[PDB]
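Quick one: UNC-89 from Caenorhabditis elegans, structure tokens please.
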Amino acid sequence: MGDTGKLGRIIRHDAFQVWEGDEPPKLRYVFLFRNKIMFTEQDASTSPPSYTHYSSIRLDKYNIRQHTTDEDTIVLQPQEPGLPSFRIKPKDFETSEYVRKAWLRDIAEEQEKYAAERD
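--- reply ---
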């Protein structure tokens, strides 16, 4: 790909420790930029593997669902041949939720600038 990438920071960027395609846990830094969700799956699979920003999702041709009622979880479903069903859990750190709660709302209406930009 190269090194022609910007910082973005236009939407949201947090690390969600979850399990993609039924495969063992990952530590992906989910970065939402413009209209796509690119998460760097920092997979501590020994040493050689891991995912150098290889995994990515686009809010165009993907199906998505969301769990709530204390258990907030964004679950995307593959409406494209290949993509697996991978969730995201509130594996933030100590106390949170309210952080990931905003993440849902973000998905429901990507780009803060579209509505009202802050900071």
